[model samples]
Target chain A: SGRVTTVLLPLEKLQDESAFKLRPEGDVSGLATDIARLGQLFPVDVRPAGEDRYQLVCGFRRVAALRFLKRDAVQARIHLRLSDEDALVMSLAEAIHATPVGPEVLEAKRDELEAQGRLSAAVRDMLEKALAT
Target chain B: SGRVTTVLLPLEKLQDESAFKLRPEGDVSGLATDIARLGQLFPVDVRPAGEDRYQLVCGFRRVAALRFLKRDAVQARIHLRLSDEDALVMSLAEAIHATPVGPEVLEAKRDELEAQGRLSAAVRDMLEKALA
Candidate 1:
């Protein structure tokens, strides 16, 4: 995919402190140092509309770190066809299957989604299935 | 803590493919892209004696990726006072603590260490403690 123009997004606009959802055992400090030096190697995956703000797809950690570094904007890989529900699903799937984000972190994320009412009926059903599995 | 010379060690000399041990669902492709774009941000930690080769301290993934990129030599952070056992312990600790490597992968690593007879009595004790 082609790269999109970088924008100066305010740090406060970013959501989900646990968006990256780092594993408790991973070397977050080293990763953070690498990010600070490298300037975000891969663009964050996002779904962009008219360019005001884009919904994050993946690379939540990268986005969070960049914001911490106080970078005005970041380069993100833009995608289409992702509903808010789709984005949440993708993040949850990544969290589940990707590096073992501890149960504690996963629980926190779930509670956050539940609070926001972002958890869709389909997602709730999927969660039930996952629990049964 | 000082940076050391870059040595062109042959690929075969490198040990432990699982040194990096990527997560199953993590964006390995994206991470690889990032590593390729930026040449290993942090230097691999190592214990060096002379001019030839050095034992690794951490950054196994970074080292493996660089070797895959076919880089002639790599910059490393040289440390002193690391026994062979210490290096192995450090690697194990980093692997265990840093990312949530799968249980299967962890088992495989333990098996490898057991096979190599590199798992020291102290380490075995530590493993027992971890399990306990």
Candidate 2:
């Protein structure tokens, strides 16, 4: 939506010590190494820092990698109206889903789907194809 | 809220095979089955098809699930300001986010998309790789 705008911003201004202030997890070195070899395939999410320094909304690992690589700037996507509370939820969503699903989670999802017993004509047709062969 | 609008739309007009046609992956049976019981936790994103029909943008999975459930209409979030270009980006953004850390499609979004370290290296190391 027009509410979101994309821009090329410096990494310095994008850094906020208090931005969300949660302890980031995971091995960022692999990611840093990846960015060093490949070009940035995605931009980070930030909201107006309101004082030229933007709040890092997402892509925390990216920022660290850039620092390690000594890169100065990267493309940034800004959310115009995303509040601190909203950003928290946004990060929470990513944090929760970014990791691969465990087998238990996958099995739970499978059971949930099975109990409802839903399917499409094309899908059913595909299954018939599976059976035919 | 008037700032954004959400409505219920029948699935018939949402049938635009030409609408952002790309192969959808991962079995949706699980999705359909989940929605059958859990109900729709989130609504599908749609924009006016301009002929009283609506163009489906995001939530192809949800739409599929609803269809399997034999539901006539699904709750849709209408984007008034989203143009075709915008819709594509919206889709791209969601597509990028829906899965886990995937290096496979990372490079594909490079020219079409832009990104930097909005900060937080847990994600940074991964983006760090994509840039290379």
Candidate 3:
């Protein structure tokens, strides 16, 4: 079930159910400002829960930031693959690895995988891990 | 001049005319590999010099990596604000500031300005600096 769906999450209704706790040392204000100024460049990942409300799977800070900017609703891209438990586990993993990683590191990992013709490893790992629980 | 335009630039036609020298510690291979596999998620910024040949303003490693992967042409997003000279200076500034800045840092800056109700300062600074 891989299809792109957009949903508008209400500012008041959205909750920070992120598996990871917020880092006091982490800087989230700059991202909030950029999103407020430029609009959300990237879509938050979510899963369908009910009629209009969706459970967030990723982008906890982004959702909060948009809400902080006083926006009534936010545009999110939702995937149907994640169950509630899966979302929890995946969110935990993300929180555990929440230290900042740049595009360069992501690119490097992608490059190494492609060089060995195993470029699908990362994607597969993510999908499998998400579905595992 | 503000509309989005797409052009296919030949690998051979692309040149690394970046004003900044490549950092020995900078990881170009990682960027190259990602583009090769993922098919260029973000569009490379360029300027139209002629009918089909466009000069790169940013994404130097991306272009080179795509070319290295034996790609014949690469898709680019071109803007008209920059002249050849402007592009040169802009590329130099980018190279000089190539140190990795995380999304957290960007977010923190945004939050501070929003709390102060002066969000345009950073954007204006970037524009002025780029134009100067």
Candidate 4:
């Protein structure tokens, strides 16, 4: 959502959201089928985790769909450097853009993220609207 | 270097420096050779010119090199909306980052862009130092 550029990132190198699953697990068969037929429309956003690993900052559904299709590499937009807190907010922001959940879910996520202390103008503005709705 | 993401754009879809060439024409053979060996290290910035064409906003040398090599597509950072004046400042800003020209070139380019009537914070800040 911020200053970033696209790069071909290996799926193996991307880390899973084991520590904290931002979004609840959901069925990805529909998304997977769409991707298998038309290919991934958007690149997932990721941030460097270690020397050669990256954290999935956004696009959990897309990632799940690619994995469902047994894909090897995914086109990803890299942050170069990003904090965990900011990454959390970024993930939530992406969720709103993709398909906003109910206000109750939004309220919970917003409270959780805000308490964590973090965010971007674009992301922030989207969250504001998401909550307002 | 603002809010942008990269996309693979065909060279044929991009426009040439037909009108006002921002930077004076310079040698691109060395840059071309480097790209041939190492590949394009960065993507060029472009603003959409028409329904299917785009104007080169930055990375003139890179575009020149790719064309010299007869390459068809270029990885470009698309500015969905950008004005010509802002594009000029952006081109000049990229030049300063690529290689600092002498202060005279900086002064002239800065004057040309500033007088043209427009400009980005990151771009404006870089041009500020370029003129100083």
Using DockQ, give the best candidate's number.
2
How well is each residue in B1-132 modelled by candidate 1, as lDDT tens digits?
212333334434444334222222333443344456533433455666455545555655555566566665555545566655444434333222233334454354446557977565644543343334
| Residue runs of model 4 more than 4 Å from their true location after superposition | A1-3, A96-133, B1-132
- Can you give the DockQ of every candidate in the order shown? 0.03, 0.06, 0.02, 0.02
Tens-place lDDT per residue, model 2, B13-126, is 686664543335356665565456435544667877677888887677667777777888887777776766556545434333233534444443332223533444333443
Relative to the real complex, the DockQ score for model 1 comes to: 0.03
Rank list by DockQ = 2, 1, 3, 4
User: Which scores higher on DockQ, 1 or 2?
Assistant: 2
Docking class of 4: incorrect
What's the candidate order when arranged by decreasing lDDT?
Answer: 4, 2, 3, 1
Deviation (Å) of A111 in candidate 3: 32
Which has the better DockQ: candidate 3, or candidate 4? 3
For TM-score, the strongest prediction is 2
Considering summed lDDT, which 10 consecutive residues are worst modelled in model 4 chain A?
A: A92-101
Q: Model 1 has how many clashing residue pairs? A: 5
Q: Ignoring the other chain, what TM-score does chain B have in each prediction? A: 0.46, 0.65, 0.52, 0.63
Quote model 1's TM-score. 0.31
User: Where in model 3 is the C-alpha error above 4 Å?
Assistant: A1-27, A35-64, A71-133, B5-8, B12-16, B20-38, B50-52, B80-132
Pairs with steric clashes in candidate 1: A25-B97, A25-B98, A26-B98, A26-B99, A27-B98
Per-residue error (Å), model 1, residue A97: 2.1
Candidate ranking under TM-score, highest first, comes to: 2, 4, 3, 1
Q: Score candidate 4 by lDDT.
A: 0.60
